[PDB]
Amino acid sequence: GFEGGQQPLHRRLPKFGFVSLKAMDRAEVRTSELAKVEGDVVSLQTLKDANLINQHVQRVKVMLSGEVGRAVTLKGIAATKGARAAIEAAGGKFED
Amino acid sequence: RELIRLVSSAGTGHFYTTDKNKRTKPEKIEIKKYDPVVRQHVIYKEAKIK
Amino acid sequence: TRNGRDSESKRLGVKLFGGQAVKAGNILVRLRGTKFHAGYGVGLGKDHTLFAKVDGVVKFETKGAFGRKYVSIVAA
Amino acid sequence: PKMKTKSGAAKRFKKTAGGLKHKHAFKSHILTKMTTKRKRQLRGTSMLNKSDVARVERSLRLR
RNA sequence: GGCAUGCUUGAGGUUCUAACUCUGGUCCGUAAUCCGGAUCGAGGACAGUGUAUGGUGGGCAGUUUGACUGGGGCGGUCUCCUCCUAAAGAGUAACGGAGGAGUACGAAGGUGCGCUCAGACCGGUCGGAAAUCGGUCGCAGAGUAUAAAGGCAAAAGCGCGCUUGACUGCGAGACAGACACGUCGAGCAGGUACGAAAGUAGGUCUUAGUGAUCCGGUGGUUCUGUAUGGAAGGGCCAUCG
RNA sequence: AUCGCUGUGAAGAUGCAGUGUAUCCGCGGCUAGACGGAAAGACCCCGUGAACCUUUACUGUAGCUUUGCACUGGACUUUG
RNA sequence: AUUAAAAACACAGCACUCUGCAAACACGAAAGUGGACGUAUAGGGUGUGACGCCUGCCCGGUGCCGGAAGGUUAAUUGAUGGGGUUAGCGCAAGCGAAGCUCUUGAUCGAAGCCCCGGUAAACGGCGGCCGUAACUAUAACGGUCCUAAGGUAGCGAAAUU
RNA sequence: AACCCACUCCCGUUGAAAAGGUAGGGGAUGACUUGUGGAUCGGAGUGAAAGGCUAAUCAAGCUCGGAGAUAGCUGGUUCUC
RNA sequence: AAUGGGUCAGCGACUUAUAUUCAGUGGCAAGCUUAACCGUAUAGGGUAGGCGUAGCGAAAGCGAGUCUUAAUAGGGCGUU
Numbered sequence: 001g002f003e004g005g006q007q008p009l010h011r012r013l014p015k016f017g018f019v020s021l022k023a024m025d026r027a028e029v030r031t032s033e034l035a036k037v038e039g040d041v042v043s044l045q046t047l048k049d050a051n052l053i054n055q056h057v058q059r060v061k062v063m064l065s066g067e068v069g070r071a072v073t074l075k076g077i078a079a080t081k082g083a084r085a086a087i088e089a090a091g092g093k094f095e096d
Numbered sequence: 097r098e099l100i101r102l103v104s105s106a107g108t109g110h111f112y113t114t115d116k117n118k119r120t121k122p123e124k125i126e127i128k129k130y131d132p133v134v135r136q137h138v139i140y141k142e143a144k145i146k
Numbered sequence: 147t148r149n150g151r152d153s154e155s156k157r158l159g160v161k162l163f164g165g166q167a168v169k170a171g172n173i174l175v176r177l178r179g180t181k182f183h184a185g186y187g188v189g190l191g192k193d194h195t196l197f198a199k200v201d202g203v204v205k206f207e208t209k210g211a212f213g214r215k216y217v218s219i220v221a222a
Numbered sequence: 223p224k225m226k227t228k229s230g231a232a233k234r235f236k237k238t239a240g241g242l243k244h245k246h247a248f249k250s251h252i253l254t255k256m257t258t259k260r261k262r263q264l265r266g267t268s269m270l271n272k273s274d275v276a277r278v279e280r281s282l283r284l285r
Numbered sequence: 286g287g288c289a290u291g292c293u294u295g296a297g298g299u300u301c302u303a304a305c306u307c308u309g310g311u312c313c314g315u316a317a318u319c320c321g322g323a324u325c326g327a328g329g330a331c332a333g334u335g336u337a338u339g340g341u342g343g344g345c346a347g348u349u350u351g352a353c354u355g356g357g358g359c360g361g362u363c364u365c366c367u368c369c370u371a372a373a374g375a376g377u378a379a380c381g382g383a384g385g386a387g388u389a390c391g392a393a394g395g396u397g398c399g400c401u402c403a404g405a406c407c408g409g410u411c412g413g414a415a416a417u418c419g420g421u422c423g424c425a426g427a428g429u430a431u432a433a434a435g436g437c438a439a440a441a442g443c444g445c446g447c448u449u450g451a452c453u454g455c456g457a458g459a460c461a462g463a464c465a466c467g468u469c470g471a472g473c474a475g476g477u478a479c480g481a482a483a484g485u486a487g488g489u490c491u492u493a494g495u496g497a498u499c500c501g502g503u504g505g506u507u508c509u510g511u512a513u514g515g516a517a518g519g520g521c522c523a524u525c526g
Numbered sequence: 527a528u529c530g531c532u533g534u535g536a537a538g539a540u541g542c543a544g545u546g547u548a549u550c551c552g553c554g555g556c557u558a559g560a561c562g563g564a565a566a567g568a569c570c571c572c573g574u575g576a577a578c579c580u581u582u583a584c585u586g587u588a589g590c591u592u593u594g595c596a597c598u599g600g601a602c603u604u605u606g
Numbered sequence: 607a608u609u610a611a612a613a614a615c616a617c618a619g620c621a622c623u624c625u626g627c628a629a630a631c632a633c634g635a636a637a638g639u640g641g642a643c644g645u646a647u648a649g650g651g652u653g654u655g656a657c658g659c660c661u662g663c664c665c666g667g668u669g670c671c672g673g674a675a676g677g678u679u680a681a682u683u684g685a686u687g688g689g690g691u692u693a694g695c696g697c698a699a700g701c702g703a704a705g706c707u708c709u710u711g712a713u714c715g716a717a718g719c720c721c722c723g724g725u726a727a728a729c730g731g732c733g734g735c736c737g738u739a740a741c742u743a744u745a746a747c748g749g750u751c752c753u754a755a756g757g758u759a760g761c762g763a764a765a766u767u
Numbered sequence: 768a769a770c771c772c773a774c775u776c777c778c779g780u781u782g783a784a785a786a787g788g789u790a791g792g793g794g795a796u797g798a799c800u801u802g803u804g805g806a807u808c809g810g811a812g813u814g815a816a817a818g819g820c821u822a823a824u825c826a827a828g829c830u831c832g833g834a835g836a837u838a839g840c841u842g843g844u845u846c847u848c
Numbered sequence: 849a850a851u852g853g854g855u856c857a858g859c860g861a862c863u864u865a866u867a868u869u870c871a872g873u874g875g876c877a878a879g880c881u882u883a884a885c886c887g888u889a890u891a892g893g894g895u896a897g898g899c900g901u902a903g904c905g906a907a908a909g910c911g912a913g914u915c916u917u918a919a920u921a922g923g924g925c926g927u928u
Contacts, residue, residue, distance in 0.1 A: 001228065001281040003464085009244075009274055010281055012465060012498055015233035016245045016267070017906040018509070018520045028911090032878080032901070051895065063911055065902065080911050097389075099254055099525080101504095109504055113254045113524065114451070116391070127391065132453045133505095135475060135918065145503085145525070149382055153366050156468095156492070157461055158435095159374060171458025173469060179436035179491050191469045193491055194436080197459075199471090212438095224867040230499095239903065240925050247465065247497055253524055255495085259487070260467090262455075265522080266915090266924070267906085273464065285869055 027057040031083050032066030034074075042074045068092065100125075102140035108133055112140070164206035168198040168219055175217060185218020231281040235270065242270040242278055 001008045029052055037046045044060060047053040053060060062074065064083040071091030079087065084094065097115045102125075104110055110131050128137045158176045162168060175182050175196040184190040185207065187200035198204070202221035209216050235242040246264035253261060270278060279285050 001231065001277060003277070007465080007497065009270075009278055009465075010228055010231035010234055013234050013247055014245045014250070014498070016520080017233075017236060020509070020907060021511070022509075022908075028902080030901075051897095055896075061909095061911085063902070065912080082912075101524080103504090109523090111504070111523070112452090114391085115254060117389095121391090125391070127449070129449065130452045130476065132475065132917065137477090148361065148380095149384090150362070150380085151365085151385090152368090152370095153493085155376070156366095157375060158492095161374090161460065163374085169458060171470065173458090173460040176460065176469090177436095177491085178434070179441095181435065189470070192488095193469070195460080195469050197470060224865095226867095236906085238905090238925070243925085245906095250498080251525065252496075257487090258452085261523090262453090269925085271464065277464095279869095283868070 025057055026059045026061075027053055029053065029060055029062045029077075030065035031062060031068045031086055034062065034068055034072055034087070035070045037072065040070070040072055042072045042077060044076055047077075099145070100143035101145060102129070102143075104131065104134060104138040105141065106134060106138070110134070162204065164204050164217075167203055168201060170198055170200050172198045174198050174204060174219075181215070182217045183214045185216040187219040187221070188217050225283045227283045228281045231278065235278055235282060237282075240269065242275065242282075243267045244270055 001010050029047060033052055034042055036050050036052060038049070039046065042062075044053075044058060047060060048055060048057070059078075061078040061080065062083050063080050064086055068087055068090040072087065073093050073095070074087065075094075076096045079094065087094075097117055099113070099115045100118075102112045102114065110133050112129055116125070124142045126139050126141075128140055131138060156176075156178075158178055160175050160182075162172055162174055168174070170187075173195055174188055177194045177196065180190070180194045182196060184196060185205065187198060187202065188204075189197040189199045191197055196217050198219050200219060200221060202219045205216075205218045205220050207216045207218055208214070235244050237243075245267055248256070249261065249264050276285065
């Protein structure tokens with residue numbers, strides 16, 4: 001950071017933002033890796049049995065980033081708009 | 097020339113800001129400019145910076 | 147009775163000389179008071195900066211009464 | 223962790239996949255003096271210049 | 286207005302003894318000018334100590350006390366603007382030569398509208414070089430809020446109306462540029478003054494009139510809000526010190 | 527394998543250049559040079575070095591002092 | 607000690623100031639000790655330095671001593687106001703008693719300082735402004751001013767010119 | 768005179784000697800000189816006061832730790848193409 | 849005539865740990881790799897974790913998309 005004695009960038013530009021503590025337990029899955037669970041149910045716990053999701057994660061939203069493949073049931077898990085369509089295309093269903 | 101403030105006559109302060117000589121004209125200004133929020137032009141009153 | 151204190155030398159002058167292709171936003175003359183004037187497609191900014199408003203090539207004609215040195219851009 | 227980032231640099235430079243983004247200076251406490259065109263063009267979150275990336279991500283411990 | 290006074294909380298005074306104090310006498314522990322204990326005397330709720338607090342405090346302490354510089358000191362200087370140096374693109378140094386700025390402006394801006402200098406020449410009963418200005422040769426030499434340069438009449442000075450574009454969101458693309466900064470710039474809308482209209486207007490003839498971050502202050506906010514609902518605090522946007 | 531001179535040269539040469547002298551080696555003396563030896567210049571400058579002194583520099587602080595509350599009581603009065 | 611023996615220091619004498627005794631003071635986180643087994647003719651500190659003749663003026667600044675009692679002023683006290691939560695009444699909007707809580711901070715507060723006087727054998731001070739007279743530089747003057755006051759006796763080209 | 772000092776000259780300066788010697792010099796019944804034992808010590812003693820002295824060291828002793836302090840400075844950094 | 853070296857022989861100065869980045873070289877590959885620890889122990893187990901597969905925004909959030917403004921109207925960042 002030292003620039004010979006002038007004000008360096010880490011003291012001359014303003015601080016900005018806060019870090020959300022709400023997003024520490026948040027995580028994202030995508031439709032490419034939804035078929036890696038076992039038993040045709042994608043839960044919060046089943047996403048932890050396969051190593052797709054850490055522990056201390058308790059809020060999962062799944063986006064669309066590939067192909068689903070198997071008919072899976074997503075309970076208690078938010079999905080996006082383009083991902084809910086690609087799951088229900090492949091025989092999926094949603095409840096909570 | 098000391099800084100002033102031009103507030104709306106509502107519960108909304110859009111607050112365009114400028115300055116003037118108050119050492120010439122000891123009363124206020126009632127000249128009215130454009131508002132982005134309320135979207136009606138309004139009696140832009142005194143600064144009253146405190 | 148004490149000298150010093152020159153200023154910081156504003157980089158004026160004819161940028162983008164008189165046969166060059168232009169795009170339609172280019173600063174064409176930096177200028178301290180319209181030594182050059184505005185021709186066909188050029189703009190005359192607030193500090194008398196000439197700027198191209200269309201594409202083409204800049205011409206630098208001399209035209210008219212008063213001996214105006216013009217800067218015009220011809221779409222060629 | 224056996225390498226400490228500047229805490230004071232992580233306040234300034236948030237990292238995205240497009241680079242290290244930062245806010246602008248000259249946007250504090252003297253604002254009736256400057257024009258609205260100069261308060262409008264500094265209000266966003268710019269990116270970090272190429273000559274500045276090496277000094278910052280040595281402070282933010284990433285080199 | 287207040288009456289006597291019980292029930293009582295605040296600042297005095299001198300007094301009382303029982304706290305405390307005694308580097309006073311006398312006993313005893315004891316064969317001791319220490320020390321306790323006993324008692325006599327004196328002071329006495331003071332002194333003194335703990336804690337909190339104001340004042341004083343080089344007695345002591347940790348320090349600071351800039352750079353440039355034809356060595357150093359003294360003086361001057363330090364940021365910004367304009368000309369010269371600067372070599373007909375930019376740029377370009379010196380304790381080289383010259384000057385300026387730390388603002389003004391609610392009109393001195395936009396626009397609508399109205400409108401163009403200065404000079405010599407001359408007419409004396411109060412001004413007689415010169416005003417009031419009336420009209421003859423005029424040939425930017427004037428004026429521009431402010432230094433100097435560069436610019437102007439499609440005025441880039443005044444009068445007067447409207448009374449706001451000294452707009453909000455932006456912004457293709459450039460110029461400058463080590464970085465942070467900085468400079469120039471339309472169309473749709475919010476919406477606009479004006480003009481009856483093409484259209485001009487995102488301040489001023491242009492370039493000085495300035496100051497980062499961090500802390501605070503203020504007004505919004507949809508954001509966050511440590512079990513939850515809120516608040517506190519934080520963030521964002523605007524602006525002040 | 528250690529001359530003078532006059533030039534040159536990081537600017538005062540035994541060593542370069544040109545040129546004069548000059549057999550080889552001691553001893554006794556004398557100190558002009560070897561910018562002779564001795565001490566990583568003491569003056570001077572430098573260092574965002576040190577130390578110690580000063581004060582009306584800054585920030586403290588021992589000590590002294592002021593009051594609040596404790597240790598700390600009653601009893602009348604001047605007094606609210 | 608090891609380049610300075612002196613005009614430096616000490617001194618007798620002198621003055622100023624503190625100190626009433628568990629003394630001022632000093633060494634001690636403290637007990638204690640020194641002062642002192644002393645007691646104002648005594649003890650501490652400061653300055654001058656036998657003796658002789660003497661020791662002028664200035665109390666503004668700063669210190670110290672005393673003084674009314676006014677203004678400003680600390681912890682402490684917690685008046686009043688503004689908020690945060692919520693019982694409840696009202697169909698709801700709403701306010702919201704009580705709490706609890708967060709800020710606000712009227713009154714009550716001493717010394718000190720501001721203020722008044724004294725104090726120079728307290729630390730200190732005993733003018734510059736010009737033309738005067740003259741000359742290197744002056745209070746003898748008329749002075750103009752200025753200040754708290756502008757150098758008395760002595761001495762003087764000096765350990766100072 | 769002893770004794771204690773240390774004014775002057777010269778020698779000595781790699782000394783006989785990390786302060787002497789030789790020739791002269793000051794005090795020499797006193798605020799004297801001295802033996803022996805003791806007391807006071809490092810922002811601390813002690814000082815007839817020079818920043819003197821506190822074991823040939825003193826504008827803060829010596830020693831061991833913090834400690835390989837720090838040094839934008841100095842010097843040095845080793846085989847070959 | 850600036851510094852250092854009288855000489856010889858020995859000794860004497862880019863290391864190590866832990867994080868990380870880039871290059872080369874490998875193993876696996878939309879996955880890859882384990883840390884403590886377990887272990888008849890360089891094996892094997894242990895995938896907690898770390899990084900990758902998705903970004904944008906201060907953030908709630910939305911996601912191949914936010915911000916802004918009354919404005920899905922105009923640009924920045926990302927994207928087989």
